[PDB]
């Protein structure tokens, strides 16, 4: 693809394939020209080395350097490693409908509810707001609904309050040591840019209030919402899986 600025970006497989093709063409030319045995053997060895480096660089001999300084990346290199396809792009993947910010206390909350900024919820539940606006007849077209949401009229807030009334969310801390690292809560619209977290779940989350952050995930389908309500709800797991003792005790 052409990079912004009139430049280009390429992968090392293109260069490996280029090398292989060029050496094969040279070998064909030398065979056609009845080259001496020593030259033919040298070309065959070069072709073997090129194919070996294409398949797995750095395995048989020294790795072939890339453009300037670094060695080339091969198919085996892409397959393997922590940054390989299996671990980085197939076992775990970035997802949509997610958000993160700083957490606060908010001691007035109940065990089954948390605090959520208005802007974060407005940004997250955009399709739901669009559908509700279309259904209520306030917006004729989805484009009109999007324009109303961008303008932030007095009715989009009511629509958001209606839709977030009984739709749980998922809160997760970046170290997930045990099962209780992800829990479900019932959002409450608040003013500000910080999430409020119940003090009782602080010990379970192993979180503090000195600049820690947490992630937010919105269940999409009906089955996911019901699973989050029936299994991942904070009130549904008060006992530690490791030992049969309470985990929401005051500190």
């Amino acid at each position: 693809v052409p990079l912004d600025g009139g430049r280009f970006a390429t992968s090392d497989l293109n260069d490996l394939y280029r090398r292989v093709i060029n050496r094969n063409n040279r070998l064909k030319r030398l065979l056609d020209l009845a080259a001496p045995d020593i030259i033919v053997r040298n070309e065959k060895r070069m072709l073997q080395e090129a194919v070996d480096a294409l398949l797995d660089n750095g395995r048989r001999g020294r790795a072939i350097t890339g453009s300037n300084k670094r060695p080339l990346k091969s198919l085996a290199d892409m397959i393997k490693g922590k940054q390989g396809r299996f671990r980085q792009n197939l076992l775990g993947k970035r997802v949509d409908y997610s958000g993160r910010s700083v957490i606060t206390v908010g001691p007035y909350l109940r065990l089954h509810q948390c605090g959520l900024p208005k802007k974060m919820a407005l940004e997250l539940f955009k399709p739901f707001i669009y559908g509700k606006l279309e259904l209520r007849g306030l917006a004729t077209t989805i484009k009109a609904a999007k324009k109303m949401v961008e303008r932030e009229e007095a009715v989009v807030w009511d629509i958001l309050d209606e839709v977030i009334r009984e739709h749980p969310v998922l809160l997760n801390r970046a170290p997930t040591l045990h099962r209780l690292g992800i829990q479900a809560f019932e959002p409450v619209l608040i003013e500000g840019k910080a999430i409020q977290l119940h003090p009782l779940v602080c010990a379970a989350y192993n979180a503090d209030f000195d600049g820690d952050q947490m992630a937010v995930h919105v269940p999409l389908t009906l089955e996911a919402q019901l699973e989050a309500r029936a299994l991942m709800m904070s009130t549904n797991n008060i006992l530690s899986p490791a030992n049969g003792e309470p985990i929401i005790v005051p500190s």
């Binding site: 040298n42 060895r45 070069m46 080395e49 048989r60 001999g61 020294r62």
Partner: peptide
């Protein structure tokens, strides 16, 4: 001395 090397440059030389 037939082996103990990996680089084809030495064998070509």
């Amino acid at each position: 001395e037939i082996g103990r090397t990996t680089d084809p440059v030495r064998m070509y030389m």
